[PDB]
Scaffold this active site. Structure first.
Site, short mmCIF file in Angstrom:
data_model
loop_
_atom_site.label_atom_id
_atom_site.label_comp_id
_atom_site.label_asym_id
_atom_site.label_seq_id
_atom_site.Cartn_x
_atom_site.Cartn_y
_atom_site.Cartn_z
CB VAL A 27 35.86 51.20 34.22
CG1 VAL A 27 35.22 49.83 34.34
CG2 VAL A 27 36.63 51.30 32.91
N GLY A 29 32.74 53.96 42.93
CA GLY A 29 32.45 53.13 44.08
C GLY A 29 32.63 53.91 45.37
CE1 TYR A 31 33.75 50.21 51.10
CE2 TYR A 31 35.31 51.23 52.59
CZ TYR A 31 34.15 50.52 52.39
OH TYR A 31 33.38 50.12 53.46
N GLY A 32 36.72 53.39 46.08
CA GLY A 32 37.61 53.75 45.00
C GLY A 32 36.96 53.75 43.63
CB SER A 33 36.45 56.12 41.05
OG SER A 33 37.43 57.10 41.34
CB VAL A 34 38.55 51.64 38.30
CG1 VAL A 34 37.13 51.27 37.92
CG2 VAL A 34 39.55 51.04 37.32
CE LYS A 49 41.46 49.43 43.52
NZ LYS A 49 40.97 48.14 44.09
CG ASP A 164 38.10 44.56 44.25
OD1 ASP A 164 38.84 45.17 45.05
OD2 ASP A 164 36.88 44.79 44.14
#
Length: 347
Positions: A27, A29, A31-34, A49, A164
């Site tokens: 879905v 970034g 700092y993190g991917s989801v 995430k 978030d």
């Protein structure tokens, strides 16, 4: 306790998650991917995430630790709750990646507004829930720092959650500074660098309400300068005594260099329920010391159809004592590992 993991790679990075979660659909970034997934245990669809190398720097590790401990502390109806947290690592020495799993409702307001026509009755309930969650958040000395439509999920029954908490933290006196999103960032973030406080979230909520009422962004600034210009085009150029309070001399000089344009009439720009206009004007104010609070907002007449003091909870205080220290990377990682291991799934 220990489940079995299967290794899947997406966008050239490995996702090691329990078999409990299936059908990983991305879905992305800094700092993190989801990834979205189905939880065979609860039967619900969830968002997973993965924090991207959470302990590569003190910044990343500190963000990971604080978000994890906040979610584990947040227990409120309008705040997203942490369903699961896991790591493929079987020991502290192998600990590197951190995964967070949470409820996945319909769609977020960003996508929703672009395909649904909203009623004033919808805006009432939505912003009431937002402020109801903010009262709980702020009462724990927590500050969100990134309230925007994409961090607000909702279902068809109009029940929403705040999402978030990656930028959130315990409120201090000097903070990170460069935070929030441009089109929802309060002026005291750009001026008065690093010395803002919890009042920033109310500015974001005001922008949210204005966007929901009108259907278009309130301050679609191309850049920082454009943001200041669009804001002052509405709220009006400030006063001398307010200018003395700005910590940055460059900020004062720039503001003074501008062609003074006053506060446009609040009933001329939202020609709309007058009560919502009144509330917006209470919220979209330059002076944080005179901006409306979430507790005060809930008592506003605009929320008479939903306001209930008995059912607006308050949180216990948050313990940042572990963070108040200047720890090394390995100490932050050990704290995060202990916080992962100590997780007990909610009923």
């Amino acid at each position: 306790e220990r489940p079995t993991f299967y290794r899947q790679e997406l966008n050239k990075t490995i996702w090691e998650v329990p078999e409990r979660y299936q059908n990983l659909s991305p879905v992305s970034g800094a700092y993190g991917s989801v990834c979205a997934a189905f939880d065979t245990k609860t039967g619900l669809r969830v968002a997973v995430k993965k924090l991207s190398r959470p302990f590569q720097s003190i910044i990343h590790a500190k963000r990971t630790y604080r978000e994890l401990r906040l979610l584990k502390h947040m227990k409120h109806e309008n705040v997203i709750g942490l369903l699961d947290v896991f790591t493929p690592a079987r020991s502290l020495e192998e600990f590197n990646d951190v995964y967070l799993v949470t409820h996945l409702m319909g769609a977020d307001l960003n996508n929703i507004v672009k395909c649904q026509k909203l009623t004033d009755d919808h805006v009432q309930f939505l912003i009431y829930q937002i402020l109801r969650g903010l009262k709980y958040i702020h009462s724990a000395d927590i500050i969100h720092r990134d309230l925007k439509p994409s961090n607000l999920a909702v279902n068809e029954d109009c029940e929403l959650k705040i999402l978030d908490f990656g930028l959130a933290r315990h409120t201090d006196d000097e903070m990170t500074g460069y935070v929030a999103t441009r089109w929802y960032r309060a002026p005291e973030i750009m001026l008065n660098w690093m010395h803002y406080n919890q009042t920033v979230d109310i500015w974001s909520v005001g922008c949210i309400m204005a966007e929901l009422l009108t259907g278009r962004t309130l301050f679609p600034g191309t850049d920082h300068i454009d943001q200041l210009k669009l804001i002052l085009r509405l709220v009006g150029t400030p006063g001398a005594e307010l200018l003395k309070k700005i910590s940055s001399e460059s900020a004062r000089n720039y503001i003074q260099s501008l062609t003074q344009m006053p506060k446009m009439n609040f009933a001329n720009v939202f020609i709309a329920n007058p009560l919502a206009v009144d509330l917006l004007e209470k919220m979209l104010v330059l002076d944080s010391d005179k901006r409306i609070t979430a507790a005060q907002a809930l008592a506003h007449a605009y929320f008479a159809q939903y306001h209930d003091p008995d059912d607006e909870p308050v949180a216990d205080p948050y313990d940042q004592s572990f963070e108040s220290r200047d720890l090394l990377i390995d100490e932050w990682k050990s704290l995060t590992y202990d916080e992962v291991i100590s997780f007990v799934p909610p009923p």
